[PDB]
Amino acid sequence: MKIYIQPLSVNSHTVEVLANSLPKIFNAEVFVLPASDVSLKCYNASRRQYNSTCILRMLPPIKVTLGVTGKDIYAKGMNFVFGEAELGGARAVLSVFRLTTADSELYRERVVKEAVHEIGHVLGLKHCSNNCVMRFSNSVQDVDRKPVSFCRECASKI
Ligand SMILES: [Zn+2]
Ligand SMILES: [Zn+2]
């Protein structure tokens, strides 16, 4: 498995977190693509948020490609989303905007959890109700309560 991280208006240090954490989690070769600013095509001026579905479309369809942004994102019908993924496809996007917090270590932990969650969807995993990183999180309090690891059921399916 190969994972391509596409920085899209994001702190380079946060990208490094993912480059350093994801290989072991996915037993994958990880590539960091050249940084770019997230496309203004995907900016909703009324909401001052970027549409995640728009961002996904602009990523290369190379499994697995994860776009990562510091901008707040939303998808249709949602006030915000942490991310959006093609289930069993090639592409996902993560926003770290809603994860911001004072404790650097907690921020880091949230970033890894939510990246792993998105990539799990690309690998074909639906939301999981177990003690699992694939749980849906309504808020960052939910993110903090779920683990970074896949449950035994989800791990068996990758
Ligand atoms: Zn999800
Ligand atoms: Zn699970």
Residue numbers in the entry: 1 to 158
Give the article text.
Archaemetzincins are metalloproteases occurring in archaea and some mammalia. They are distinct from all the other metzincins by their extended active site consensus sequence HEXXHXXGXXHCX4CXMX17CXXC featuring four conserved cysteine residues. The overall structure of AfAmzA resembles those of other metzincins, consisting of an upper N-terminal domain (NTD) and a lower helical C-terminal domain (CTD) with respect to the active site helix α2, which harbors two of the three zinc-binding histidines (H117EIGH121) and the catalytic base Glu118. On the other hand, as the homologous archaemetzincins from Methanopyrus kandleri (MkAmzA) and Methanocorpusculum labreanum (MlAmzA), AfAmzA exhibits a second zinc-binding site located in the CTD immediately below the catalytic zinc binding site and close to the eponymous, structurally important Met-turn.
Consequently, two different crystal forms are observed, one triclinic and one hexagonal. In the nat-AfAmzA::malonate complex the catalytic zinc ion is coordinated in a tetrahedral geometry by the three histidine side-chains as well as by one carboxylate oxygen atom (O7) of malonate, with ligand-metal distances of 2.0–2.1 Å. The catalytic water molecule is displaced by the malonate O7 atom and is moved towards the catalytic base Glu118. While both nat-AfAmzA structures with carboxylic acids bound in the active-site cleft superpose quite well despite different crystal lattices, the structural superimposition of nat-AfAmzA::malonate with NHis-AfAmzA shows that substantial changes take place in the bulge edge segment and the S1′-wall forming segments, effecting main-chain and side-chains of the corresponding residues. This is opening up the substrate-binding groove in order to provide space for a ligand. The side-chains of the conserved Phe80 and Phe82 residues move slightly while the side chain of Met78 adopts another conformation. In the S1′-wall forming segment the side chain of Phe136 performs a χ1 rotation of 115° and interacts with the malonate carboxylate group with its Cδ1 just 3.3 Å away from the malonate oxygen atom. The side chain of Asn138 follows this movement by occupying another rotamer while its main chain Cα moves by 2.1 Å. On the other hand, we detect upon ligand binding opening of the active site at the S' sites.
